[PDB]
Design a protein around this ligand. Structure first.
Ligand code: NA
Lengths: 141, 142
């Protein structure tokens, strides 16, 4: 868990920190006007777990990673929504396809292309919505 | 290769790709800029020898970052701009554990930002032509 980039977003809400997973199985992005939160399902030290960060409003959009598929990009926009500085839009790329945007509120763009390596986990801040998000990076095996 | 983590590049697809790799100790960076980011010099040491590599073009005014003892690059940010029909770095700056430098350049466009919560920049890659078309970084633990 030595390489953490981000977080992008605001200073509100409460901190979360997943740490790195052995393998990410799926990510669900909950969104409506903004990004409400994320589920991450993953393997970890012999266990399989699901963790939820942020709120649970909006609609879930699930990206299931197939055998040999991994996350190689994240991008989005940081927006003001109802006075909260949050992820207004969020998306992800795998080595196969890009997904998103999830959310509808424009703001300040950010983008993280990973030319070598993969996203292995998440940290950030959450409340009613997803205030901020960053990622753990690991090399490819 | 060999466990590298490379993020970026941010910028356009013109010019010629460069890739310094991560093997070297970065001593200083010089960002040449005017309206946009024209180029960069990266000076590094390796086995007691100091070398400078220049990427991008010949224009712009220099803006230097000379890393002090115990000073490491821990952020990069800027703007990707359309300038005279090319997609290039319109602004580029860096942060260390000590100080923020820049950004340098005068043309906005699409912002990017790389806060590094854990880790440091250990090398550069990107694309350079008349201007600095794009830039990315190698990361390692701190
Ligand atoms: Na896919």
């Amino acid at each position: 868990g030595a390489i953490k980039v981000g977080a992008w977003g605001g200073n509100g809400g409460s901190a979360f920190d997943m740490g790195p997973a052995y393998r990410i199985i799926s990510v669900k992005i909950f969104s409506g006007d903004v990004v409400d939160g994320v589920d991450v399902t993953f393997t970890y030290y012999g266990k399989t777990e699901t963790r939820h960060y942020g709120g649970s409003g909006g609609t879930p959009h699930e990206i299931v990673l197939q055998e040999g598929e991994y996350l190689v990009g994240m991008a989005g926009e940081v927006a003001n929504y109802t006075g909260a500085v949050v992820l207004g839009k969020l998306g992800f790329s795998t080595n196969k396809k890009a997904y998103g945007p999830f959310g509808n509120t424009g703001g300040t763009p950010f983008s993280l292309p990973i030319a070598a390596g993969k996203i292995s986990g998440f940290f950030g801040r959450g409340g009613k919505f997803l205030d901020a998000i960053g990622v753990y990076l690991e090399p490819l095996a």
